[PDB]
Design an enzyme around this catalytic site. Structure first.
Site, short mmCIF file in Angstrom:
data_model
loop_
_atom_site.label_atom_id
_atom_site.label_comp_id
_atom_site.label_asym_id
_atom_site.label_seq_id
_atom_site.Cartn_x
_atom_site.Cartn_y
_atom_site.Cartn_z
N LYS C 86 1.06 -1.48 -0.36
CA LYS C 86 -0.31 0.44 -0.32
C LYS C 86 1.24 1.25 0.34
O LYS C 86 0.76 2.38 -0.66
CB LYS C 86 -0.88 0.02 1.00
N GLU C 108 -10.39 6.25 3.58
CA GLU C 108 -11.10 5.38 4.19
C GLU C 108 -10.22 4.34 5.28
O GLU C 108 -9.07 4.58 4.08
CB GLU C 108 -11.83 4.69 3.50
N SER C 376 2.36 -10.26 -0.83
CA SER C 376 1.56 -8.21 -0.33
C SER C 376 2.30 -8.27 0.86
O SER C 376 2.06 -6.21 0.77
CB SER C 376 0.02 -8.09 -0.77
O1 LIG Z 1 -11.08 -0.77 -0.61
C1 LIG Z 1 -11.56 0.21 -0.19
N1 LIG Z 1 -10.02 1.37 0.61
C2 LIG Z 1 -8.94 0.58 0.92
C3 LIG Z 1 -9.38 0.45 2.41
O2 LIG Z 1 -8.15 -0.76 3.11
P1 LIG Z 1 -8.04 -1.10 4.28
O3 LIG Z 1 -7.86 -0.27 5.38
O4 LIG Z 1 -6.57 -2.22 4.70
O5 LIG Z 1 -9.30 -1.83 5.11
C4 LIG Z 1 -12.11 1.20 -1.42
C5 LIG Z 1 -12.17 2.50 -0.70
C6 LIG Z 1 -13.03 3.15 -2.02
C7 LIG Z 1 -13.67 3.05 -2.24
O6 LIG Z 1 -14.80 3.62 -3.67
C8 LIG Z 1 -15.04 4.24 -3.08
F1 LIG Z 1 -14.44 5.76 -2.64
F2 LIG Z 1 -16.19 4.71 -4.07
F3 LIG Z 1 -16.18 4.49 -1.66
C9 LIG Z 1 -13.50 1.75 -3.29
C10 LIG Z 1 -12.66 0.95 -2.44
C1 LIG Z 2 -4.98 -4.16 1.89
C2 LIG Z 2 -3.61 -5.08 1.67
C3 LIG Z 2 -4.54 -6.19 0.52
C4 LIG Z 2 -5.54 -6.40 -0.68
O1 LIG Z 2 -5.69 -5.30 -0.81
P1 LIG Z 2 -5.27 -5.00 -2.47
O2 LIG Z 2 -6.11 -3.45 -2.83
O3 LIG Z 2 -6.59 -6.00 -2.80
O4 LIG Z 2 -3.96 -5.85 -2.69
C5 LIG Z 2 -3.41 -7.13 0.53
N1 LIG Z 2 -2.43 -7.47 1.12
C6 LIG Z 2 -2.52 -7.07 2.59
C7 LIG Z 2 -0.92 -6.87 2.82
C8 LIG Z 2 -3.25 -5.88 1.97
O5 LIG Z 2 -2.77 -4.40 3.38
#
Ligand SMILES: O=C(NCCOP(=O)(O)O)c1ccc(OC(F)(F)F)cc1
Ligand SMILES: *Cc1c(COP(=O)(O)O)cnc(C)c1O
Ligand SMILES: O=C(NCCOP(=O)(O)O)c1ccc(OC(F)(F)F)cc1
Ligand SMILES: O=C(NCCOP(=O)(O)O)c1ccc(OC(F)(F)F)cc1
Ligand SMILES: O=C(NCCOP(=O)(O)O)c1ccc(OC(F)(F)F)cc1
Ligand SMILES: O=C(NCCOP(=O)(O)O)c1ccc(OC(F)(F)F)cc1
Ligand SMILES: O=C(NCCOP(=O)(O)O)c1ccc(OC(F)(F)F)cc1
Ligand SMILES: *Cc1c(COP(=O)(O)O)cnc(C)c1O
Ligand code: NA
Ligand code: NA
Lengths: 395, 253, 395, 253
Positions: C86, C108, C376
């Site tokens: 990320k 978010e 990842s």
């Molecule tokens: O999957 C999303 N964020 C990842 C957060 O990652 P983590 O903190 O690892 O849960 C994510 C966030 C926003 C989104 O679109 C919209 F903004 F339109 F809502 C689509 C996917």
């Molecule tokens: C957040 C995360 C994922 C899933 O997010 P993707 O956008 O699908 O790559 C995968 N691996 C790790 C280590 C993460 O933190």
């Protein structure tokens, strides 16, 4: 007879029972052979590169130094596989063990980081790993104990003595004295009997080598000083080694001051202990007036080895390196500062080195100085420790 | 004084081996330790090996680690160990008394001063457990300057250089770990060998002497009787007396 | 009018309220400009190198593959600063925000990793960061919340709706619609409205670029397949992008199967959901029969975005990429396997990719195949999760 | 049917603006929501804007999010919303009824089928909150094929291209967010403007009409009275009747 000098000035040696001498002499001859063997060097380099992730970055900290004449770089050992510098030397020591035909690894651990480092190296290299850890440490380091067991290591709680690091060290050496034909003892710092202070330095010296190349590339001259925390001495000697002959480069080692030198609750034997003979070596240590070995205290359990590597004691004695101390509170402030201003969570160990650089900058903010701090590890492991302190005193 | 030389000459005249118990000074307290030592002598100990409680007794097994812990629980310090040693020698003028020490305790207040203190209280030898012969120079020099015999361990695998060093540098007796070595040491004119480690029955005392050792050392076996009888000091002494008597009888021709 | 195509086949678009269109159009024009600007590219590369630690290693796993005709390499995103991939894209997005003259970042987060990544980038680049996180997530992710606050971010618990990731996303977008002149929304995956799927891919594509170079150096040919877990799609698209035109290289994306597809408790919308319009895009999602948006379930909270990036849906539709799923139990087994046999603790997210490679090897152990798994992230964060499961069922 | 065209022609004849309340279908239950809607009409609503409860109402503020939640707690589904709509039209044949929808609910079972269902129950317009004009083609085509007016938001910052798109593509009314825009929309022959967002007092209804809007929409203010009076349904209706009457009186010349 040894092949190499076991002393640094008066300090060091091989103060072990007679029965352990052949193990030390075997190890020393294996090391000397390995150091002359380009295939061993190539294999070690290959693991460091493709497994551990060397070279590590050298990161400038302009957000911290803004408005002063300090330039600060962090040597990013926190980005090494396993999250601390310990990985470098365990990989070389595991290769050495294989060179000698050993199929088992014995290690000691206090705060669990060396235990995890030994376990990961052993898992990679197909070695059966057993780790001695004081029962009190086993209790206060459950995340690290479970990492070791996940990696296939046998973790052996030690109940003898005070059930802490010294007792773990003793049990490891006892085991080794009977098993050295098939087991290698993977000592976790640049201390203990010869040849371990030498070996561990040599297997950490890429820290300083890289730092030199990187600082020359980025600034066109050597640092004014390189700064490293000192628990046992491994990350500091690894940073320092390649600069020893560059006489204009300061070498500053930072011991833990704990609650403060004056309180007696510290882990600063180099500057505030007394020379003794223990852990197989002659070195400054934490000890009672009549010669019983004591503990070091620090907010950071990784800095609690109650002595120090003999090369550090020697480098201090001749004035080549300077040693200072940093309190718990100072280390906490450096930890918060790096999180907030660079988005890097440093290990509390490493935060002692950073705190002293911050002091160097803040005390004389119009002094031109180019500093490298060895950021020996990341501080994910310390976030609950830091949270609970910051909670206990409001926040 | 040449107490070991006198002892071995008298034992040789009697076709007898030495029996040498090991205990920790001040285990389980000062007064009871003094009584235990007197009981070992009254039961036929030829010499004594005495440990000084140390924080990190690396080269000792659990029985002896536990003995150190008991002695620390009683507040025993090296200074009190030396007062004990003075009283023991004052009661028993000819018995050789050897210390088992760790290097820190010797080095702590100055190596010379340590061996001077040994001489003043009438100790005969010191084995520094964690000083190998290769680094022993300042220890053995200081020992000899104060009429103290430096004692070295000779491991069962010892190579020829190590046997020559041990034979050259040691005095009083050679500490042999549990027939080839015994003959080589004699060849190199070493101090007489005492066999130690895991000697716990009469049969092993006889066997050591028959192999050509001048005697045998026993500690764990003795300290076990201490540990086992903590609640009954008077029975402790009676069991110690029985065991030492039996073990000493096994050394007689 | 957009500068770039907002769709991948039928999937994607910009399904947001009218008032948010200017923010998206501003962002898109800033991105297109940035991509043509060698100084922006140089600055981004410099951060990746000297701060984040790129390039990351490519590690062979001979201990795992012994006795089979599989060769397995792990692309070591676990060694990136922050411990997951990320970090790559948050640094580019933070640079973009500065390019546009923005001084604030909104993000978010569900499981907290994107929140921490956004916070660290914001701290480095001097941006004021505010993070929306569902109140239930705030409760189950206290280590990550405290990391964010250590790094100077404001963490805002969201109580609306189900108080989870969807609600956090909504609150972030609401804030942005009123603040986009001074704030950039740092979306955390290759999903959401255009231009975010494109941007996030481009700012992750060095994963595959490096992988290509490294595999060519080490093996002299391209992989037979590259395998990556898919929560939202960012690490997978970053691995895949540079291989799309290498038509002989398989692209396998692994969605979480949770307790099993048949149970309904999974997070595999690409293969087991239904196309809907939500999160600003047309994509497969987890939804009720009448169109209410649902949750994804996985042992790994990082895989719980209940839709998937539109480029993945498109790549599946044309048969360029194949998508599969891995259960919790399979992922746990891969996690244990990597710890034990390579001394690497993988993130449970990543363990899904590894579990599928293990399956590819074990099912056909005499099939010649050269596999790269995108590792990842590291799994220090998952050790209590794994411990508690292994405890609950004996062990 | 051209219910909006008929309404605005009659209001224009009377020099009167429209007053258009927004509420959520099925908040706080089906039977009480039906009563609330009838009360809004009996108090002088010229048209209705009605929301269908959706899981993730992105474009709505807390009052309306809360209304959706109440409706979900009552088990309200889109299918039950459409049965409600049929009953409302059957009771009130000329009042324009507009839906505020999210794209998923329109797209879910097929866009055409959605607008067919709207036509069958007698809905007049649909605003899809998260479809911008630039991507509205399939929505507005399907709307128009089923005699449903597609409604678009015109933001206060709208550029000239956006004003032309809105004026060209919208029908029924133009949703204007809370004097330049009003004149441009009229210039481009847009559907008549209704001003919405934060309209909560009589004074703001008059102001909107005086600025040249054909009327005003109010939701939060109305739904607040619902939320406030959950325990007292009969008082809820009385307060709704008072507020709507006052707000409608402000639109009269
Ligand atoms: O999957 C999303 N964020 C990842 C957060 O990652 P983590 O903190 O690892 O849960 C994510 C966030 C926003 C989104 O679109 C919209 F903004 F339109 F809502 C689509 C996917
Ligand atoms: C957040 C995360 C994922 C899933 O997010 P993707 O956008 O699908 O790559 C995968 N691996 C790790 C280590 C993460 O933190
Ligand atoms: O400091 C030591 N180990 C480091 C353990 O590191 P950690 O796991 O981080 O506590 C250490 C271990 C052994 C030692 O010498 C000897 F073996 F003789 F006892 C000296 C120092
Ligand atoms: O002596 C040993 N065992 C038994 C005899 O001692 P004790 O049982 O205390 O009399 C013994 C064990 C280990 C050893 O080497 C080292 F310390 F390095 F580990 C040296 C001596
Ligand atoms: O004499 C000793 N113990 C008593 C005899 O052994 P045991 O009967 O087995 O307890 C004894 C002697 C030496 C020693 O340390 C080292 F070997 F390192 F020098 C430890 C114990
Ligand atoms: O409408 C808004 N606020 C108030 C009016 O709605 P409500 O209070 O529910 O009637 C409103 C708020 C934000 C918005 O953009 C986005 F969804 F993208 F965030 C669109 C509309
Ligand atoms: O008509 C609406 N609400 C009622 C009037 O506003 P208020 O009185 O402030 O509740 C209304 C209209 C559109 C909308 O979403 C979007 F803007 F995206 F299309 C949300 C609410
Ligand atoms: C163990 C450790 C230290 C202290 O050990 P040294 O041998 O003194 O370098 C310092 N930093 C970290 C991150 C450690 O894990
Ligand atoms: Na120390
Ligand atoms: Na998903």
């Amino acid at each position: 007879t040894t092949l190499l000098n076991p002393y640094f000035g008066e300090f060091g040696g091989m103060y072990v029972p007679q029965i352990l001498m052949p193990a030390l002499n075997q190890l020393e001859e294996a090391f000397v052979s390995a150091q002359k063997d380009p295939e061993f060097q190539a294999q070690f380099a290959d693991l460091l590169k493709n497994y551990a992730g060397r070279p590590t970055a050298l990161t400038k900290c302009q957000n911290i130094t803004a408005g002063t004449r300090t330039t600060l770089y962090l040597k990013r050992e926190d980005l090494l596989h396993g999250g601390a510098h310990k990985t470098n030397q365990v990989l070389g020591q595991a290769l050495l063990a294989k060179r000698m035909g050993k199929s088992e690894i014995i290690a000691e651990t206090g705060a669990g980081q060396h235990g995890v480092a030994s376990a990961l190296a052993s898992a990679l290299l197909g070695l059966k790993c057993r780790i001695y850890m004081g029962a009190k440490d086993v209790e206060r380091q459950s995340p690290n104990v479970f990492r070791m067991r996940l990696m296939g290591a046998e973790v052996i709680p030690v109940h003898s003595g005070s059930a802490t690091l010294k007792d773990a060290c003793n049990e490891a050496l006892r085991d080794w004295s009977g098993s050295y034909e098939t087991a290698h003892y993977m000592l976790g710092t640049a201390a203990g009997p010869h040849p371990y202070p030498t070996i561990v330095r040599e297997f950490q010296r890429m820290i300083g080598e890289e730092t030199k190349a990187q600082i020359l590339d980025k600034e066109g001259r050597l640092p004014d000083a390189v700064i490293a925390c000192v628990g046992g001495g491994s990350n500091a000697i690894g940073m320092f080694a390649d600069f020893i002959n560059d006489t204009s480069v300061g070498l500053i080692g930072v011991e833990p001051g704990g609650h403060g030198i004056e309180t007696g609750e510290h882990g600063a034997p180099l500057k505030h202990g007394r020379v003794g003979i223990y852990f197989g070596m002659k070195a400054p240590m934490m000890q009672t007036a009549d010669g019983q070995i004591e503990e070091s205290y620090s907010i950071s359990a990784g800095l609690d080895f109650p002595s120090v590597g003999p090369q550090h004691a020697y480098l201090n004695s001749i004035g080549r390196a300077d040693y200072v101390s940093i309190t718990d509170d100072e280390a906490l402030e450096a930890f918060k500062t790096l999180c907030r201003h660079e988005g890097i969570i440093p290990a509390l160990e490493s935060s002692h080195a950073l705190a002293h650089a911050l002091k160097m900058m803040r005390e004389q903010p119009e002094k031109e100085q180019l500093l490298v701090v060895n950021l020996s590890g990341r501080g994910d492991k310390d976030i609950f420790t830091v949270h609970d302190i910051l909670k206990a005193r409001g926040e | 004084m040449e107490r070991y030389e006198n002892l071995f000459a008298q034992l040789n005249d009697r076709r007898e081996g030495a029996f040498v118990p090991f205990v920790t000074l001040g285990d389980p307290g000062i007064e009871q330790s003094l009584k235990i030592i007197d009981t070992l002598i009254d039961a036929g100990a030829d010499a004594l090996e005495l440990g000084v409680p140390f924080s990190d007794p690396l080269a000792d097994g659990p029985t002896i680690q536990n003995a150190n812990l008991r002695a620390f629980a009683a507040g025993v310090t090296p200074a009190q160990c030396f007062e004990m040693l003075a009283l023991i020698r004052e009661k028993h003028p000819t018995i050789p008394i050897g210390l088992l020490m760790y290097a820190n305790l010797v080095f702590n207040n100055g190596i010379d001063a340590f061996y001077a203190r040994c001489e003043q209280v009438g100790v005969d030898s010191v084995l520094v457990a964690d000083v190998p012969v290769e680094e022993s120079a300042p220890f053995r020099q200081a020992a000899l300057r104060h009429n103290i015999a430096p004692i070295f361990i000779c491991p069962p695998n010892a190579d020829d250089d190590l046997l020559r060093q041990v034979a050259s540098y040691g005095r009083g007796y050679t500490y042999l770990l549990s027939h080839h070595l015994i003959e080589k040491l004699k060849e190199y004119h070493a101090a007489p060998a005492l066999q130690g480690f895991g000697i716990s029955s009469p049969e092993q005392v006889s066997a050591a002497v028959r192999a050509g050792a001048a005697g045998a050392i026993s500690g764990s076996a003795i300290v076990k009787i201490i540990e086992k009888n903590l609640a009954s000091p008077k029975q402790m002494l009676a069991e110690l007396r029985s065991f030492v008597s039996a073990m000493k009888a096994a050394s007689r021709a």
